[PDB]
Amino acid sequence: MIPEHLSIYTAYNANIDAIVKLNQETIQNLINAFDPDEVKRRIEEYPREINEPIDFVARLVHTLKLGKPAAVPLVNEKMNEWFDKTFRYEEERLGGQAGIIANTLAGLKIRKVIAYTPFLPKRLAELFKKGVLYPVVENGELQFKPIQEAYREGDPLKINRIFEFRKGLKFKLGDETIEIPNSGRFIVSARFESISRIETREDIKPFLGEIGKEVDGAIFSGYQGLRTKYSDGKDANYYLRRAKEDIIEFKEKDVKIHVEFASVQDRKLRKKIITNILPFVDSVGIDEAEIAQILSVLGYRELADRIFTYNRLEDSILGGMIILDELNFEILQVHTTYYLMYITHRDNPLSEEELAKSLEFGTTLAAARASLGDIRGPDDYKVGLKVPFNERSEYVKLRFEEAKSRLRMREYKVVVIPTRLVQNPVLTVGLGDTISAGAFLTYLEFLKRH
């Protein structure tokens, strides 16, 4: 069942996600450090990014009193040390699509899992599972090390911080008492320059093809971390030309490549990624929100608006077909709350049943991880079998048949299954990534058999 003989490389995004519990002592001690009217002044002026500590407290306490969640970018690297010296973390865990994917695969105990990120400080390296390899240059040659032991002292440190606040708590901002209405999280995302240089670094770059010889597939993600423009005159395009070069090295070695897409708010960057990356890879993983974002920049604004507004199976099948037809990679996987879907060219070697089985492995693996919070060993996949296909399945199936009646299916194989939906899971972060990892893993297994 688990295709344990396959070897997979993942890049490029891995980071620390760190959680802080805002109890009374913690929030009051923080506020106490500042001048109260200095804080008040900063709230009304409303900082939309965090450059200095007063931006942070201001945005936070505004969020705490409203009792409504918020995410705010950290755009100054030097703040890492401030956060770390001011707060204690409940938990530090691995985040970033490549990180999560690497840890899930190493939890399945496949034959080999190599992960790469250009930024590997010790603190990040130690959050990976045992078993994940990292490529390094040693004595002028390629070697792999256990990733926990491959860290570079001084590498840039990407850390996203989730502040949990629970209802009930009161604190004071000078004389003014303040009770928190609801629970929630205040999220501070790493969005400074040093962690936005998303690439294979120059030392390892010359060995990518040698790395390629060691794997059956590579899963690439994290393009969404690129910025428009960089300090040293580099730009998104510069990094995207390097990204294309990496793709070429693996595909020349007969590696199949899967790109897991992501939300890219800047439409121009989103357009550059789609243009530069998608037509050149084999497999692509998107969610329902992403399908519309892509269509929107491809010019299909009406259909994108329909998808966003009504979330119908039919409009997603049409929109997936358009994206495949326009971009001409090999297979598209769409993940949605109630159904997963594959769209392939008519000459894809897999049968409908194998395509279904691959999707089923994906939703099963994700349901497992959503229930347990972590894949420790291959038997854990079986926990996903305990999560039934959702209550909308029969309606999904009926609507799929109606959709096939309305829409053309000449040039395309379209396969739809219902998800093993977990209502309210131990782990929310990265379920889409885990679906794609399982789907792509089994897609490789079936191709290899063919």
From Swiss-Prot:
Pfam families: ADP_PFK_GK (PF04587). Residues 1-449 form the ADPK domain. It comes from the Archaea. It catalyses: beta-D-fructose 6-phosphate + ADP = beta-D-fructose 1,6-bisphosphate + AMP + H(+). Mg(2+) binds at E260, E290, D433. Coiled coil: none annotated. Binds 1 Mg(2+) ion per subunit. One of its GO terms (cellular component) is cytoplasm. The active site is at D433. It is found in: Cytoplasm. Its cofactor is Mg(2+). GO terms for biological process: fructose metabolic process; glycolytic process. InterPro entries: ADP_PFK/GK, ADP_PFK/GK_arc, ADP_PFK_arc, Ribokinase-like. Keywords: Cytoplasm, Glycolysis, Kinase, Magnesium, Metal-binding, Transferase. The keyword Chaperone does not apply. Its EC number is 2.7.1.146. PROSITE patterns: ADPK (PS51255). GO terms for molecular function: ADP-specific phosphofructokinase activity; magnesium ion binding; phosphofructokinase activity. Pathway: Carbohydrate degradation; glycolysis. Belongs to the carbohydrate kinase PfkC family. Catalyzes the phosphorylation of fructose 6-phosphate to fructose 1,6-bisphosphate using ADP as the phosphate donor. This is ADP-specific phosphofructokinase. It comes from Pyrococcus horikoshii (strain ATCC 700860 / DSM 12428 / JCM 9974 / NBRC 100139 / OT-3).
